[PDB]
Ligand binder design. Structure first.
Ligand SMILES: CCCCC(=O)OC[C@H](COP(=S)([S-])OCC[N+](C)(C)C)OC(=O)CCCC
Ligand SMILES: [Zn+2]
Ligand SMILES: [Zn+2]
Ligand SMILES: [Zn+2]
Length: 245
């Protein structure tokens, strides 16, 4: 997903997915300790910094190849042979965040949590779980899709407090893998001969540009809602793990 601006949801789907996940935690009145939501906002600057850094600097963006932002659950690999992938990279920062949290270094803890949230966010994007990059055919489709997503995401906010509490085990890796498994299933609903064709023709016909946008919207909405619920449960797991209990 996009992350064009460090502090604005308008062009940052990643931040939007997290803010909505936090809203799910606020809406929950039976399980979530609201003190946790208070902490996230208290260190919101470090959180958002982490969410944004993943796409603009090393080692997070792997020299502009973003190899660590992909993870195919079937073979457990990214699109580049022998490169680091999203599951191990996301888990890495989840743990680094927790250790800094236990040493009372909040700035460090939430920066790292932000990075981890970014990776978990990417595997909910079908293309990232199937190694379809911006250079994959049709080229340019990957980024134009993620840009289009920012214009319609607000129509798919989860308005209840039911996140996927303890969705997977206690190992962050299981959550990233589990999320990628679900996103890869919805891959075909976004990337297929039709969308490929219309996206190519869209170049010379405004008529087609709208055609693929419409075709990918339903599945996009479904992917966005899941991402919010899984992220909410992921954040809750982090706090239960390092929250000193
Ligand atoms: C100018 C063309 C770059 C387009 C692009 O979508 O780059 C970032 C994504 C993956 O990262 P995510 S978190 S979904 O980043 C989307 C936002 N931007 C483009 C601003 C980093 O990586 C690629 O598809 C690999 C090939 C690069 C030419
Ligand atoms: Zn992304
Ligand atoms: Zn992408
Ligand atoms: Zn990314």
């Amino acid at each position: 997903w996009s992350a064009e601006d460090k502090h604005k949801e308008g062009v940052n789907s990643h931040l939007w997915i997290v803010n909505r996940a936090i809203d799910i935690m606020s809406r929950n009145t039976t399980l979530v300790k609201q003190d946790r939501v208070a902490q996230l906002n208290e260190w919101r600057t470090e959180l958002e910094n982490g969410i944004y850094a993943a796409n603009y600097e090393n080692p997070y963006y792997d020299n502009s190849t973003f190899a660590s932002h992909f993870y195919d659950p079937d073979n457990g690999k990214t699109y580049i042979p022998f490169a680091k992938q999203a599951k191990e990279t996301g888990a890495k920062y989840f743990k680094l965040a927790g250790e800094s949290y236990k040493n009372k270094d909040m700035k460090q803890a939430f920066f790292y949590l932000g990075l981890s949230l970014h990776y978990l966010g990417d595997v909910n994007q079908p293309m990232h779980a199937a190694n379809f990059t911006n250079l994959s055919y049709p080229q340019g489709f990957h980024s134009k899709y993620e840009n289009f997503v920012d214009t319609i995401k607000d129509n798919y906010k989860v308005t209840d407090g039911n996140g996927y509490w303890n969705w997977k085990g206690t190992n962050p890796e299981e959550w990233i893998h589990g999320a990628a498994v679900v996103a890869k299933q919805d891959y075909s609903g976004i990337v297929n001969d039709n969308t490929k064709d219309w996206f190519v023709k869209a170049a010379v016909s405004q008529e087609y540009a709208d055609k693929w946008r419409a075709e990918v919207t339903p599945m996009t909405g479904k992917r966005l809602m899941d991402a919010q619920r899984v992220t909410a449960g992921y954040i809750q797991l982090w706090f239960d793990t390092y929250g000193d209990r």
